[PDB]
Amino acid sequence: TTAAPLLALLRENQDSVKTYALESINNVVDQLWSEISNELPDIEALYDDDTFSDREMAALIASKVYYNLGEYESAVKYALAAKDRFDIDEKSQFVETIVSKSIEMYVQEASKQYTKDEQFYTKDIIDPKLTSIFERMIEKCLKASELKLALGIALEGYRLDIIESALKSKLDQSTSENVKIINYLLTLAITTVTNSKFRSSILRKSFDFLMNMPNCDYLTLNKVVVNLNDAGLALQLFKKLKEENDEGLSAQIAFDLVSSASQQLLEILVTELTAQGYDPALLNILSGLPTCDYYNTFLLNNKNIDIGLLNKSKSSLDGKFSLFHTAVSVANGFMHAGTTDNSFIKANLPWLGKAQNWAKFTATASLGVIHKGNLLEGKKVMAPYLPGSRASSRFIKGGSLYGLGLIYAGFGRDTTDYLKNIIVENSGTSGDEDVDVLLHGASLGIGLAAMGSANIEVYEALKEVLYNDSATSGEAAALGMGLCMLGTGKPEAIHDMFTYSQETQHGNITRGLAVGLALINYGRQELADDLITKMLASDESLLRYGGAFTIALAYAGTGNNSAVKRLLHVAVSDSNDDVRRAAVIALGFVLLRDYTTVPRIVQLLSKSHNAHVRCGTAFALGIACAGKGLQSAIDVLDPLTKDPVDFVRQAAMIALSMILIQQTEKLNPQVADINKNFLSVITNKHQEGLAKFGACVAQGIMNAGGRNVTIQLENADTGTLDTKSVVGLVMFSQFWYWFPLAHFLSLSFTPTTVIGIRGSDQAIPKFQMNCYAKEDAFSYPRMKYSSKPYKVDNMTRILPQQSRYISFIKDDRFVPVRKFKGNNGVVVLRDREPKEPVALIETVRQMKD
Amino acid sequence: YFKLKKLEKEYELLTLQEDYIKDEQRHLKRELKRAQEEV
Amino acid sequence: KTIEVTAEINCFMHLLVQLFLWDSKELEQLVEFNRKVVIPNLLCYYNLRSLNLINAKLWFYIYLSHETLARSSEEINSDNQNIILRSTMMKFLKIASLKHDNETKAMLINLILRDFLNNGEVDSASDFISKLEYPHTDVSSSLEARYFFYLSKINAIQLDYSTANEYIIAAIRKAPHNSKSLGFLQQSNKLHCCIQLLMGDIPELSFFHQSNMQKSLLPYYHLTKAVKLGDLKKFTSTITKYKQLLLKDDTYQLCVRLRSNVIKTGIRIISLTYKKISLRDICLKLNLDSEQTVEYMVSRAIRDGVIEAKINHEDGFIETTELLNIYDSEDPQQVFDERIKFANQLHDEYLVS
Amino acid sequence: DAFRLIDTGALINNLLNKANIQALIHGLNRHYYSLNIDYHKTAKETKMLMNLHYEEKEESNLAATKSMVKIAEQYSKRIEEEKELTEEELKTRPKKHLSETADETLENNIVSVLTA
């Protein structure tokens, strides 16, 4: 085994002599390589000549040797220069291995280069050789008929041209198949790509591809206007909808977007729509007033209230301080949420008589929870207790302005303008206790009304409240500014507010502004990183606590590794107690995109010492896993219920219920034991106070909104996240700095129900639906498996578990336009023969209008 | 290539936990020293 | 289908294995067929992750027979057959990835390394070792010792007595059980004894007496004594006797290498400790060893570092240093650094387990 | 601890409830309760507390010097302690104690090599 005869000839000169060896050596490089490596300097010497033009053949032999050594960067370069002898379709052990490394190298380069430029692959900034190979590698994947290989590489290597061309060529007319492809790619770009500039371009392009087809799946078209937060896509879609007018379809589109899409996007789109001419039926739908009324009808019929249980719990014992009134007040609100039963409160009136001032403010804002989902009667019922129609005391009035914001969140265009007059009044007046509380509720209430929409007039009115330097009003005021300027916000707003925290000697205000900045950040990503440092660098606990949520909110939705990592850091290295809880609760939010990651993340934290850590992860689980119920979470929570520390017990009970909302045995066996416990603690006279809030309130969540509402981080109509649910949930984890803030859970209660709409009149009917709601593997909550056909009327209780399996029947004479969309959410079916009623039930929109 | 992405998700969870454990051993050790003095 | 296919592939590995050592039909005849199963229809099936579904045994048995030359004694005298096998195995080493196929990578290294050692260049070694160095979790204890042994022998040829010493000592640890305490242990032990002799001198022969085959030990004793006592005449006459030994072991090279050392060892015993030692005594001894290089040898010794001295040939005197109470400062520095290293490694081994 | 009697005028929400505390301040004004503790401090105060633990330079070094003078004796006593330790473990064939004794001897040697 010798290469020596051949190797010897390289050291001699004459081009003929060099040629005779080269080609002998070429065949057997892989075989003879040990000997050939020592002659490597000489082989490089052939290459560096350009008068002897069999340079490329030297290069190819040399590459083989370079691979075997482990200089991969060097081999790749020589392999390029070899040119017409590097063929990637031969596919040996040689060819495959250097090809791998080649894609690797472009990808690396393509990261660095995307950040600098957006055209680089068309230019001579990077290697044409590398490029050429990249373009063939792509041809190879599209030739093999797998599109998921073609796209995968093109994505990683930051080229827009390849993605575009690949979908296009392979776009076939069928329609059904295209749509599957475009959705598989939508999941993939969104959950993997955190570079906005790249991702946005793939998202926008996928709209344009569905658009090129004669029929196209409108639910997916709706999804993408939500995703990109872009007006342009939506307008073009709607002019298209004018040519193809089906009234059932056009209505289906508007009900999907109104629930799922951001509030501001919808508003500006209606402002443009009005001006071009649109149909006024549609313009009404896009406000979201009909949608909210459809749910009110649902909750009125399907209520499953159990008011005896709360009576029995209130009579169990009576003791010291304001925490336990907060507990009953909060459990009432959750129970009666959206159904509009003041039954408990109407009947039983003496316990209200025991209540002091802070408890009155808490109980009145529970009335706000009940009367949610009234679009005209919200104000009216509350009206004798609402300014200008003076009651007997202001403590009563203060939870009215707060609650009025709750009901009327998401329709608050008006509600802002009403409350701001109150804000101007009591910036002016400050010195008595009654006006301070009056304005504290007005300020929680204004921040709800102006939510998420920069109204700079509101920013100024609340800001004067700060200067008066009252701990009661200012806490609200500070939080209010955060809610309003959530999104991009002012540069000013951030800077003014951060500074004023460091100056303040008042506690309540610092905390209030701390949380206030976390909120301002919502999708602002790395551009908030600066304030995060400032906040953490404070030796103030309050700003550090808030600081964790500023990363939670800014990186919410698709996560980031650095972001999670920075929070793991904060939780570990800050021995101050409060700060540890905020950091662990914060983890939940980055990781809301897939709830599955959370039990793993927090497994270490669950055995981690400090009760503030263990409690905080309970709440986080609560938030994160409540989308479908997660069995792996409930298990983690179980030990934590039987924790000896009073507050870890509390959080576990509350957290359990948030996952286990609208669930039963055979879906979760464990819920019976859990229910026993919640009861057992209250009835007892031997437990501690903190635990006892947890038990009463836990019950209130499980059984909340007449057993018809769930806690999800989304509003279901396409399954894409909505603003309100998130914000609401960050506010709800807080009970500790001011007792009623629980109430924000009201925004994150979503009804789960299939709601049909007869499109010929735009009003709800009833039809059977083929379904799997059988009592052979399911139940509903009253004090898995599918094989048998089952039917039921519309506007009925529908679990997450049951939601999976909905279908529809076409022989009540209604046929769905988009069929089922996989999930709960308002639809519109077309009535084939419209000449008569074959079902047309009552709706509460026909009792308002 | 689509595959690779699936494998990255499982990888990414491991890297984050693995780094977190290091930070934990180091805090636990100081806390162990002080607490022994406290008992 | 999964279960059926694996079962066949395992079945074949057993069948070939059973069919050698104790159930073959002639080892040389069978080689073709072994080569046929490997190259098409086997590497092709594997997804580059095999460690246990191919084994050292197949390549070991085939190659062992080509080097036996008494159940073979070629089938082509052109040397086509054996050259081709060396190429095919060399080609496989490319195929065993630099991130996967890790146990199988190492088995290839041992076989290739042997063939170069018997008869070839052993600077061809240099590449294989660099390639070998990557994270391993799967290379077994037997293979490790084999590694160490080939590696020591090469370094011994190149003249590093020290490197080969550490490796050889490491070799005879771990692997030796009852199936590696057999012929392999004997090869290793020969080299380990030799190495100690060349670097310096070998420990006592007492230990080796009960830990090895006695048949080997008697020829090894004879060889060590001649070197230690230092007489040239002893060394040649001994070398002459155990020609058969040095040939089997592949250590005919010892004869060249050990010779310088013998002559050196014969001056060294003699303790030239006095202020002057007369020239005559040293010339007297050397005459038997060396017929024309009596002055050259005494000079050679001084340059080497065997004795620090002065000679004048006018006055015909050797003046020397005290060869007794040497070993002073910084000799502890060397010991102190080296012994701490040994301690850290053992503590590390405690932490792991 | 930090205390205050019943004193009202804001403590009227303080000591399923609320009947209790209204009657508690109505049946008796002035009964103790504990209050919560926090410590707020200032960064210059904070830095002063940590710089307790060039005089500093002089001291560490001083001990180092005098340790080196005396080491001839310090050597001898620690072999004797060590000799004892080895012997104890033989009989013994507790463990924590034997280990700690060896650990102290090793720690001290490293510090001593370091000193020069």
Swiss-Prot record, chain A:
GO molecular function: enzyme regulator activity; ubiquitin protein ligase binding
GO CC, any one term: proteasome regulatory particle, base subcomplex
Keywords from the named record: Acetylation, Phosphoprotein, Proteasome, Repeat
Domain of life: Eukaryota
One BP annotation, GO: proteasome assembly
PC repeats by residue range: 362-395, 399-436, 441-475, 476-510, 512-545, 546-581, 582-614, 616-650, 651-688, 694-730
InterPro entries, alphabetized: 26S_Psome_Rpn2, ARM-like, ARM-type_fold, Proteasome/cyclosome_rpt, PSMD1_RPN2_N, RPN2_C
PTM annotation: N-acetylated by NAT1.
Pfam short name (any one): RPN2_N
Additional notes on this entry: Present with 4750 molecules/cell in log phase SD medium.
Subunit structure: Interacts with UBR1.
Function: Acts as a regulatory subunit of the 26S proteasome which is involved in the ATP-dependent degradation of ubiquitinated proteins.
Family of the protein in this entry: Belongs to the proteasome subunit S1 family.
Name of the protein in its database record: 26S proteasome regulatory subunit RPN2
UniProt source species: Saccharomyces cerevisiae (strain ATCC 204508 / S288c) (Baker's yeast)
From Swiss-Prot, chain B:
Intracellular or extracellular location(s): Cytoplasm; Nucleus
Reported modifications of this chain: N-acetylated by NAT3.
Organism superkingdom: Eukaryota
Transmembrane segments: none
Role: The 26S proteasome is involved in the ATP-dependent degradation of ubiquitinated proteins. The regulatory (or ATPase) complex confers ATP dependency and substrate specificity to the 26S complex.
Family: Belongs to the AAA ATPase family.
Name of the protein in question: 26S proteasome regulatory subunit 6B homolog
Lineage: Eukaryota, Fungi, Dikarya, Ascomycota, Saccharomycotina
Parent-protein residues present: 48 to 86 of 428
UniProtKB/Swiss-Prot annotation, chain C:
Gene Ontology process terms (BP): proteasome-mediated ubiquitin-dependent protein catabolic process; regulation of protein catabolic process; ubiquitin-dependent protein catabolic process
Species name: Saccharomyces cerevisiae (strain ATCC 204508 / S288c) (Baker's yeast)
Domain PCI: 145-325
Miscellaneous comment as given in the Swiss-Prot or TrEMBL entry: Present with 16700 molecules/cell in log phase SD medium.
Family note: Belongs to the proteasome subunit S3 family.
Record gene name: RPN3
Residues found modified as Phosphoserine: 329
Name listed for the protein in its UniProt record: 26S proteasome regulatory subunit RPN3
GO annotation, cellular component aspect: proteasome complex; proteasome regulatory particle, lid subcomplex
From Swiss-Prot, chain D:
Superkingdom classification of source: Eukaryota
Phylogenetic placement of the source organism: Eukaryota, Fungi, Dikarya, Ascomycota, Saccharomycotina
Whole sequence portion shown: 154 to 298 of 306
Post-translational modification summary for this protein: N-acetylated by NAT3.
Domain notes: The JAMM motif is required for the deubiquitination and degradation of ubiquitinated substrates.
Subunit architecture: Component of the lid subcomplex of the 19S proteasome regulatory particle complex (also named PA700 complex). The 26S proteasome consists of a 20S proteasome core and two 19S regulatory subunits. Interacts directly with RPN8 and STS1.
Biological role stated in the UniProt entry: Component of the lid subcomplex of the 26S proteasome, a multiprotein complex involved in the ATP-dependent degradation of ubiquitinated proteins. RPN11 is the only catalytically active member of the lid and serves as the essential deubiquitinase of the proteasome.
Name the UniProt record assigns to this protein: Ubiquitin carboxyl-terminal hydrolase RPN11
Family under the similarity heading: Belongs to the peptidase M67A family.
